[PDB]
């Protein structure tokens, strides 16, 4: 449509922002302990996937 380029780029930007936020949160919680209800803190990562509408944007299903 010559306009899905904006959608693809926006999805890429959102995914990169999510990944950066996760990394920053892990760095902040590097030396934390005993979070809520006492369970130890565990690090998290994100998984990128493509939206097969072929060629499509990137999404993050879950952390």
């Amino acid at each position: 449509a010559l306009l899905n380029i904006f959608d693809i780029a926006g999805s890429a930007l959102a995914a990169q922002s999510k990944r950066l936020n996760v990394a920053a949160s892990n760095l902040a919680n590097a030396d934390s302990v005993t979070g809520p209800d006492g369970q130890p803190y565990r690090a998290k990562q994100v998984v990128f996937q493509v939206d097969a509408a072929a060629t499509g944007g990137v999404k993050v299903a879950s952390v």
């Binding site: 005993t34 809520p36 209800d37 006492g38």
Partner: protein, 46 residues
């Protein structure tokens, strides 16, 4: 169930309060003079 109390309490610093003198009994040394006196126990001259 059992977690840390999760409370914050920041200190401020340290100050000197007093200097106490150990009013113990010191040793006696002989000066051989005839007008020198030494206290055995408690008491102060005036």
């Amino acid at each position: 169930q059992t977690t840390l109390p999760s409370g914050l309490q920041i200190g401020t610093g340290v100050r000197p309060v007093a200097t106490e003198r150990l009013h113990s009994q010191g040793n006696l040394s002989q000066t051989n003079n005839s007008k020198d006196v030494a206290i055995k126990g408690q008491g102060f001259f005036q």
